[PDB]
Amino acid sequence: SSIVCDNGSGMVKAGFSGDDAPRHVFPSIVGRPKNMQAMMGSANKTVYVGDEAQSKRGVLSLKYPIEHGIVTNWDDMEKIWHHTFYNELRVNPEQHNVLLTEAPMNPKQNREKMTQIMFETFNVPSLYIGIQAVLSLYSSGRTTGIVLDAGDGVTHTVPIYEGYSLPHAVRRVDMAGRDLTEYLMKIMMETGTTFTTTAEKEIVRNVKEQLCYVALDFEEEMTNSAKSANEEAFELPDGNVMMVGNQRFRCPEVLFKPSLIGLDEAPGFPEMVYQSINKCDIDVRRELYGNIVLSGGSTMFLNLPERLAKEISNLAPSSIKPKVVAPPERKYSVWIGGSILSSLTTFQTMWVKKSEYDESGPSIVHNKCF
Amino acid sequence: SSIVCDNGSGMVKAGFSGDDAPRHVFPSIVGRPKNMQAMMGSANKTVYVGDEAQSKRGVLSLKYPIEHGIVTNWDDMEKIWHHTFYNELRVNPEQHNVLLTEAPMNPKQNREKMTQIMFETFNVPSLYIGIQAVLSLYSSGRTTGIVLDAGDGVTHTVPIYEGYSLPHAVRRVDMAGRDLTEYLMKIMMETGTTFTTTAEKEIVRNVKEQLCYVALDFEEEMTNSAKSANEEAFELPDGNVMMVGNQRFRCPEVLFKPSLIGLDEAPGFPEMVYQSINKCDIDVRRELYGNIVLSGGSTMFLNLPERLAKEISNLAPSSIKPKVVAPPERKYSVWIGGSILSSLTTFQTMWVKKSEYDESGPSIVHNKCF
Amino acid sequence: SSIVCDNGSGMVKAGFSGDDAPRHVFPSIVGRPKNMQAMMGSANKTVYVGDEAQSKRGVLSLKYPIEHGIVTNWDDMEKIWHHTFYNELRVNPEQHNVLLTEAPMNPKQNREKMTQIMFETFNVPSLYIGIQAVLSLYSSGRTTGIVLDAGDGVTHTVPIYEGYSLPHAVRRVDMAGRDLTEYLMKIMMETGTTFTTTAEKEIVRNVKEQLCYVALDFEEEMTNSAKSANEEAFELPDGNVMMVGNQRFRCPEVLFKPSLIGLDEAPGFPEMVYQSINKCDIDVRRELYGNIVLSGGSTMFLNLPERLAKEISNLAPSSIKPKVVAPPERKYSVWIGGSILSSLTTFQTMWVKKSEYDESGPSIVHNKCF
Amino acid sequence: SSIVCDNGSGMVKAGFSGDDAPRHVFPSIVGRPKNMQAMMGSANKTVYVGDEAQSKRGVLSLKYPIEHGIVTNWDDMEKIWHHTFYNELRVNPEQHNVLLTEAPMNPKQNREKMTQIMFETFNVPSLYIGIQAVLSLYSSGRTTGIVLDAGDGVTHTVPIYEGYSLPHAVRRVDMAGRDLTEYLMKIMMETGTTFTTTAEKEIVRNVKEQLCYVALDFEEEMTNSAKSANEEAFELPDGNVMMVGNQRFRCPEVLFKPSLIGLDEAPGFPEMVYQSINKCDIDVRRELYGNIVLSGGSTMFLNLPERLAKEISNLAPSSIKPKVVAPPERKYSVWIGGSILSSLTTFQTMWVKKSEYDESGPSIVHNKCF
Amino acid sequence: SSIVCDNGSGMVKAGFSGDDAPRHVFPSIVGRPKNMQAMMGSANKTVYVGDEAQSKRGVLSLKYPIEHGIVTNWDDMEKIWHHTFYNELRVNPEQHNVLLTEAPMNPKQNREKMTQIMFETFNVPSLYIGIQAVLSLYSSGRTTGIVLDAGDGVTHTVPIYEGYSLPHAVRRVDMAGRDLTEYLMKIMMETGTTFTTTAEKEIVRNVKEQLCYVALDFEEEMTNSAKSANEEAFELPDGNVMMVGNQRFRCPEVLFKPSLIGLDEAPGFPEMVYQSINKCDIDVRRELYGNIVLSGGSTMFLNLPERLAKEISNLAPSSIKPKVVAPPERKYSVWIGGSILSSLTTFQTMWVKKSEYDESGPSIVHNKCF
Ligand SMILES: Nc1ncnc2c1ncn2[C@@H]1O[C@H](COP(=O)(O)OP(=O)(O)O)[C@@H](O)[C@H]1O
Ligand SMILES: Nc1ncnc2c1ncn2[C@@H]1O[C@H](COP(=O)(O)OP(=O)(O)O)[C@@H](O)[C@H]1O
Ligand SMILES: Nc1ncnc2c1ncn2[C@@H]1O[C@H](COP(=O)(O)OP(=O)(O)O)[C@@H](O)[C@H]1O
Ligand SMILES: Nc1ncnc2c1ncn2[C@@H]1O[C@H](COP(=O)(O)OP(=O)(O)O)[C@@H](O)[C@H]1O
Ligand SMILES: Nc1ncnc2c1ncn2[C@@H]1O[C@H](COP(=O)(O)OP(=O)(O)O)[C@@H](O)[C@H]1O
Ligand SMILES: [Mg+2]
Ligand SMILES: [Mg+2]
Ligand SMILES: [Mg+2]
Ligand SMILES: [Mg+2]
Ligand SMILES: [Mg+2]
């Protein structure tokens, strides 16, 4: 059976082809102890991976090997893959095909080192690497539309018409949920709460995923909270209680005005879609407006699909009725689409075999995997 | 049953003998994709013909095999004929007679290659090729008059008296509707609209067929629009709106003064008829002035028959009253006349049989088909 | 004395008639601060123009008022002209004649608004507007030849024979150096360097003007760099070093195959000249092939004149020997030719006086300036 | 005359505008007796403020109202301000303007309560609050550079270019001289000396300011002292003598490696400057490296400017020559700059008047004081 | 077999590894006669050690070599060790390994002189020194929790999580049972009983260990005894009877408010635990609250565990349920844990051999014994 591994900046999702959902989802982190061992009977390790690092984070310093979709530490990246094959799936990687994913317009060296490790360290028989936004269209059962994908490190838009690519309209911003966590941690200091460690950053991420929401009218929302000053209580791991005010809707507002974090010229979600559509062709634009697909975990805020539709309607001409499609399970769209694609009988010739890599070299991955 | 196929520069019209109208009319284009396939489940082809190419033109580059009445790509010309027999009429071409049309004073190689393909590739039993302007007289039920035919690539005039040809008075200009589309696309840039692709050229052709008209007095019309500056709105496929000013009546004015597009010595519609009549005989001219017949799609502009009659009256002597006949269905005159001619019992000996071609060779078509 | 101002998409060149070179050349940009003032003693402005904006670009957002030869912001366009008259030339514009330039086939509204501002805001006595490619022929001292002009926004070709214009052979593409900067910035991401701001775009423009060159044989050049992988180092303003590989010759290759940036049907430099010549007359073509003149800053790449000559020779018939003339100072050909033309004694009747504008109105500029 | 009051965690500095130095500097402490009065003729108080508390500290328990730049006891904070106006300056606070200082990224409630006390309790006519690091640039007579300020509770870095703020590059650590005193008191127990009371903590602070110095090479310095074991004698208030060994250079080493006190992820002085510079813009970094300004009492250790310059040079690229500016009087830079700023004639409109506070409320301080 | 010797300020506990309890427990005192010998046949010594000194204390002056965990007389310290090896265990110290204990944050010279005596005077083969609070966790069979140890001279708290040390949260007060004996001896004078000699101080220590208890509500307990005035009788060695009133619960109240003996700023038992927990990490505090371990002889008062739990619950947040673990045999926890640790097979490499001391010197003990 073939293995589908959706590895992004934040999470790892692994499973087998043909299933409807991944069976193993864990954070993509590596932890190391920062103090000396005091007892003698402990079964402590020297490096912690995955959920082990998350649970013992009180005594560890945490690192993410991938930043903005690019691997910055290959030694720690092999530890995560070694964890996935032997501890999560519990298989022998020499007997399965592996399908991987990547963001568009990445440096070529990132794709070449990934292939070298898979063939030489793990001895995989055959390999394939896909583009994340294309795999999201497979899960929706359509061949026309524009996909907005926002995860932990990158946001990109890819338009497709009748199954044909439009390479000159692809956009990428490099600003996603991890930058939202840092902004929330900073504006939280206005109320007297300060977090600085990597372990405390994981607490801030939980506050974002439970209390933050998109305001339908931002300017009115600020005025109302200035007078009412309604607040909500959050319970910290140590038992204390933290109050959250207007930080709840100011944090996701970055996705609509990136100048709050210094990106004074980055477009933002409505303009990113609008500019990408107007670069395709005049005879294609009406169909693209009718199928706008949301994907990724950073699109899971409450009221985000409704706010996005209203903003685009103010940019498009009067006769255009934009339609935004937001599946309830869009956090796993990339993995689901990859499971569908690898099950097709016509795909069996698209695998990159080990024998071809032995002759052509690492550069063969660029010729194939289109 | 016999097949009538009126194939010009722009359109294909096909049907069966005895009918009052063709049953299949589609543009004569071939489309090819200009980008790479991105999905795997699509039923995409590699070449598109006819209305398929028109609908998917946003991702295709379009070509016309015929230019100025002469085939410039025989491989793409066979694709169009193959489309007509098997997808439109859905017949076996080995059991029907085929009647084709051609413009006068064409190169001899054009007619010879057409015969070779029909007999050897499609194995047609018998064949015939006619002159387009002569077939227009059949549909009017007359044997005397001069025909002005203007389609997409060629304009020609042919006079006939009592059923006798007058070979030394035939004229041909090679300037028709496709040159009108290019002129409209150029003078449209004076108002800030630029179209450059082949797909965008199809949009300009729709603007010509809906908003352009012939001005009865050109010089007065320009003066009035200089002050009023009245404009009309046209809605583009993507939802935007384009304003059209005096380009509405300047575009068809080319047919009356070809020096606007650089043909400083070509006559134009009134002079083309006038010069053709004065080359026939003094005892024939009065009858020719009384029956001037319009044919083709480029004669469908509003006010064109009225403007033409006035201009000729300024050239003819005072005792002559020219009369212009413009049937409301003159876009299909050539096809209708060919349907009538092929139904006559005296025509059954005029077919060129396959056996004769086997002996004489391709040159037999010149001896017959007179 | 008369003033010559060559204002294109990228640069402003100003001076006085009779001189051999302009005395003031600065970029055509306007800058505005994007953060709040923190100190109190600074002499900061609110808008920066010219070289002031270039030097302080670290804290400013930059805009070009002119895009593709058409003014898109008239308020910022007046600031640039106000800067030129009072800060660069330091004259009173009510005592001098002004000669301006424009690209062919521009919208009529662009020329009318330019005249209204000059007469009403600056109170210029007399005015004239010329065509850039014609002024380049004056600087070469010839009356026959075809001019290829490529600046920052537009590329056009204009043929002239014995001093007579050939209006139906003029071509224009709207693709020039600014599109080359954007393509270099995109293919630079394949090596792990990302620039997104307007200020960072000025750094990419300096890399193009120092390291990029035209490859004589493109296909062989790619193969050699695939094995040798020779690279060159460029020093960034902050002290870091960037390596440039085969991006050096891939960037100017767009001028020879515009399908790399999506213009799948635009001709390119050799085909643009070839198509323009074959539209003139059969008795003029041999003289045009003998005088092909290069003008503009986008023609300054190394090996460009040699590559252009070879490509044209493969399109022309065997008995034709094309000759390309590339002056070493062709970046200032338009300004130099305008200085010559305004010094002629026969030109003194060609000025458009203010009194005529008072009666006829802004439309007088179309009747004159031919 | 206007009053300038620089109130930090450790000291109070007060004076009048226009002077070159403050006239009153005293510690910011409040003392209360811990035993019962035994005699009857004493003029003892119940609360001691300032130098009175310092002298009688043998029978008092001492508290600091401000911790890490944030007021933790407002009742004791009013006693310190009441002491400053009536006992030190000896003025009526209803006739002078007051200028105050604050650290960046402080909680908003801290600034609001400060304004309420000044207007309602002391009836000040007009008020203003500034940022400490900005006022340090005024005293140096420059508008470009990055300021490192380290006092008793907070360390922060603020970059400024051409008088423009760069809000997204400000950093703050909350670790300063008071944490250095606690670390020295702990490692002093390795030699058999134990101090536990608040009064004994003032003795340890005097040892830090007289015997501690920065080692140019820390690892070599430890090795040399392991063999030589050279020591220095310090005389205690009671007449006994304490010997100090390698604690002299280990105490200020915390500023270069904060993991010695448990802040395993805080950067430290060289990394704090390096990270702040690399967040500004590529076109600004070279000027920032050339002007690095030291401010505050915790930068007064011997050899600190020389060690800082060497460490930064190992982080910057090879073509960069960092320059550190350390004025001999940098302990009073914030007060001096505030005296200069309040003397400017353009500043007279920046005062926040009492009438405005009556209408807008305490929130007016956020709109102004930028 | 290995020897375990738990030597604190008050008692000596010695035994062999593997046993469940020490076999020899005697006070750590040295006695000398204060009068002249009168008879001739007596077998009197000149120095008495251990239980010999306790029995003949009527004619001796007693001294403790160790005060606050630090040896103040090394000559008398060797007499106690010589007594333990030859009179109590009756072994040859050249054939056994010795494990010793020490309080945290002791002067380094104390540990170095101890090693020098063991290796050079007694010629021990191998040696090891541990931290007392860590050894108490071994006896409980846990790797997480915070230990409160209070003996005769020192009180300290040490938190441990998952076997990892937290060095920056260790606290030490230097106030234990010997200070409780002196306070009881002073407040006993309010009822007319005066003890001044060292021998009489041993009688007061017996009164503390039999009649003193912790009051659950101190303020109510004082009020009840003011009216009832209930008293208890104690029989002195000479036959007289002493009455004890409210001194029974006032003596152990010092452990909860150290200001009764002049330590006005020392925290006390509930605050010592509370401050130590809040210095560890937010993700560790909940587990520490659930395992609070009592150790040492000064925790043996009646009702002490119940009073401690109630006081901590008033300091912790509402969702926290503190749990105090008080083993019935906690007076020997340090010795028992050391017996367990020295029996582990993984510990056999942790011994400090004599050969290593010969080369490295006395400083080797700091590198090991972590
Ligand atoms: N319900 C939610 N609301 C807002 N953000 C979320 C939610 N769930 C997950 N996220 C954010 O999505 C990011 C990761 O998204 P995902 O696409 O699943 O991972 P990856 O970036 O690895 O592809 C994380 O930064 C996380 O904070
Ligand atoms: N209503 C109309 N008004 C003006 N032009 C028309 C109209 N309808 C068709 N045309 C033009 O007629 C041309 C084709 O005419 P037709 O004779 O039918 O085809 P063909 O040239 O193949 O014989 C096209 O260029 C089209 O733009
Ligand atoms: N040496 C060079 N090599 C390549 N390109 C150049 C060179 N010098 C200038 N350019 C380009 O020429 C463009 C401007 O050319 P120019 O004709 O002088 O200005 P304008 O477009 O305003 O007329 C700019 O985009 C610049 O990048
Ligand atoms: N010569 C010195 N060497 C080292 N530290 C010093 C020296 N002088 C003062 N300090 C320290 O500076 C701190 C206060 O600095 P300062 O900035 O003047 O006060 P504040 O923190 O109130 O602004 C005190 O902790 C003091 O110990
Ligand atoms: N039952 C008891 N109640 C109160 N205090 C006790 C009790 N038993 C012993 N102590 C006190 O404990 C102290 C010694 O405790 P321990 O920890 O055994 O010795 P060390 O201090 O040498 O480690 C002595 O001061 C003694 O008075
Ligand atoms: Mg993802
Ligand atoms: Mg026709
Ligand atoms: Mg130019
Ligand atoms: Mg300060
Ligand atoms: Mg003990």
Author numbering:
A (entry chain A), B (entry chain E), C (entry chain D), D (entry chain C), E (entry chain B): 6 to 375
Provide the publication's sentences verbatim.
We show that, despite > 1 billion years of evolution, pathogenic Leishmania major parasite and mammalian actins share the same overall fold and co-polymerize with each other. By applying single-filament biochemistry we discovered that, compared to mammalian proteins, Leishmania actin filaments depolymerize more rapidly from both ends, and are severed > 100-fold more efficiently by cofilin. Our high-resolution cryo-EM structures of Leishmania ADP-, ADP-Pi- and cofilin-actin filaments identify specific features at actin subunit interfaces and cofilin-actin interactions that explain the unusually rapid dynamics of parasite actin filaments.
To uncover the molecular basis of rapid LmActin filament depolymerization, we determined the structures of ADP- and ADP-Pi-states of LmActin by cryogenic electron microscopy (cryo-EM) in the absence of any actin-stabilizing agents at average resolutions of 2.7 and 3.3 Å, respectively. The conformational state of Leishmania ADP-actin subunits within filaments is also very similar (RMSD 0.785 Å) to that of muscle actin, but with small variations in the D-loop position and in the position of subdomain 4 at the pointed end. The Arg196Thr substitution also breaks the electrostatic interaction with Glu236. These differences suggest that the pointed end tip of LmActin is more dynamic, and this may lead to weaker intra-strand interactions with the adjacent subunits, as also supported by the slightly lower quality of maps in this region. Of particular interest are the three methionines in Leishmania actin, two of which (Met44 and Met45) are inserted deep into the barbed end cleft of the adjacent longitudinal subunit. We speculate that Met44 and Met45 could form more stable interactions with the adjacent subunit in comparison to vertebrate actins, and could thus compensate for weaker lateral subunit interactions within the filament.
